[PDB]
Amino acid sequence: YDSNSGGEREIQRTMLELLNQLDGFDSRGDVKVIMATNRIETLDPALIRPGRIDRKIEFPLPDEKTKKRIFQIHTSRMTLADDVTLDDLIMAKDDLSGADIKAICTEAGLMALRERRMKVTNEDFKKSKENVLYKKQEGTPEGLYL
Amino acid sequence: SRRYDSRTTIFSPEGRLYQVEYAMEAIGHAGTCLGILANDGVLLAAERRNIHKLLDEVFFSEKIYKLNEDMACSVAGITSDANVLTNELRLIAQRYLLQYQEPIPCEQLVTALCDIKQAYTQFGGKRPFGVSLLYIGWDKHYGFQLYQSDPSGNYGGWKATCIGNNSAAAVSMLKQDYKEGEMTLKSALALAIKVLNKTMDVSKLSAEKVEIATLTRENGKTVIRVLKQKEVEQLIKKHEEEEAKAEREK
């Protein structure tokens, strides 16, 4: 978009010169550029068209396979006691990311420090699983599709 | 002419249903039913949604409908829609007895209804039903059974299911607390009084806001018991006493 005011033109010229020096075609010396946003439909179309970028990699959804590593990765650098059961936490909840897993492990660490202990018991993980994960659980067609 | 049609038949462009989803996401509001069994007997705890001081209760069976000599149901949804199905489901069980001189088994009563509920979703553009109801009963093949019904026409066998969306915390309690072949008619009843105490927002569980129907197999009679008033009250006094006794360790 081109307006008459002087608040938007400082973006467009910087964008236009970027597409110019990306495709300067004088001597680039094989410089690899990786660009990433969340959404794609509200972007600049001439950066999409070939001659510019020919790799459009999508990063789809999850599963209960990739989670168990991230549980183990986030529960590695802590005083993980020998009384904790993470497998019950894995099977029960069925939609969470690693940023959810991180928020579980931190709340588990906080609950252990409220009761003036060093190690963390399973109960701090159970409450952290029930506390933190209740912020977005909304919308499912259960028992309709086998 | 054709521009007034609401098109309840077409799939979503998402590739799923669109109108039946509205009724199933409606059905969790305003109504709380449950039922339990692990041994000889099965119960149905209900919840009086509005108890105003100017009503009569001349019927002594408000939500529970004794649809047969061996079965009953607990409906939660549109009240007017309930009278349509329960008049129909009662007549399904009776033409079976005319044909076979034998009491209707409980599964093929449920599949008889759910095929009626499905067919009014596909063809006609008719409004689907807004009813999810439960089933108790006894037969000669398995015995004491529970069933869940959906507005889609989908059903299932259960042991501690419910209906209302306020009872999502109750099913978590039932996964936390349930036994395998240890129902008495004290154990399951005190457990059901424990559930509606926490899940419903009624303070101290007024005995006129709940309703309990049980079913036992007496000799050959399959007595459907509907308990009236004071046994509920002394049950609550029993439950509050067991709460007051157990909190002494705190």
């Binding site: 086998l146 | 038949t9 077409i10 462009p13 590739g15 599949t111 067919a119 066998g157």
Partner: protein
């Protein structure tokens, strides 16, 4: 009395309702099935059992007659109408012709049921996809499939449900006649395929076979653990 066309054409030359119906098959539990020369096998995944509830009513493999076996995906209410429609026809075929029903005859009954059901007026098309398995006379084990449009084929290994193309890829690099030689090798192969899709913690797999002589038998959950253990043992020899 309902006169309203529901399924019409599109300007590019496609339909709308059939492509919307096959999404419901895509949002369903996976069920695979292979065959052999003497015995067949089919299983299903994504049980997701509440583990405190009844499960004799959650069965999603049934039989039309003493030869023909079922395995569907999609939604469940529309499957029940198709099954009770098909049990009547294979029983009425036995009334006129004194044979057992051939497995090819009943798949033409289901597919012709579903095609005239997308053709007519006022009628939402079905949302299932069946796997029809049965060994005919002269001992000819075979399996067919359906489609919500009403087409049908003959495969050697099918997969449907949520994530069949991964399973179809896993069966694609599995083109061995030796796996269809030993009976228990074929069954662990299905368990190898189903564990490749679902998380499969030994309680989410329901397989069932048919030895072309007897009605179908659901295997015992000890045998599911017995087959998964020898699958783990044979896979542990990768070194």
């Amino acid at each position: 009395s309902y006169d309203r066309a529901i399924t019409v054409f599109s300007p590019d030359g496609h339909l709308f309702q059939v492509e919307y119906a096959q999404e419901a098959v895509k949002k369903g539990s996976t069920a695979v099935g292979v065959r052999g020369r003497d015995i067949v096998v089919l299983g299903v995944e994504k049980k997701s059992v509440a583990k405190l509830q009844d499960e004799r009513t959650v069965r999603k493999i049934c039989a039309l007659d003493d030869n023909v076996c079922m395995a569907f995906a999609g939604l469940t209410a529309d499957a029940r109408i198709v099954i009770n429609r098909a049990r009547v026809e294979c029983q009425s075929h036995r009334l006129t012709v004194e044979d057992p029903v051939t497995v090819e005859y009943i798949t033409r009954y289901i597919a012709s049921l579903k095609q005239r059901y997308t053709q007519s007026n006022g009628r939402r098309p079905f949302g299932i996809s069946a796997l029809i398995v049965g060994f005919d006379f002269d001992g000819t084990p075979r399996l067919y499939q359906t489609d919500p449009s009403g087409t049908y084929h003959a495969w050697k290994a099918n997969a449907i449900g949520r994530g069949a193309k991964s399973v179809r890829e896993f069966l694609e690099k599995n083109y061995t006649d030796e796996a269809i030689e030993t009976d228990d090798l074929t069954i662990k192969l299905v368990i190898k395929a189903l564990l490749e899709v679902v998380q499969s913690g030994g309680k989410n797999i329901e397989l069932a076979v048919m030895r072309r002589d007897q009605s179908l038998k659901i295997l015992n959950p000890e045998e599911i653990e017995k087959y998964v253990a020898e699958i783990e043992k044979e896979k542990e020899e990768n070194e």
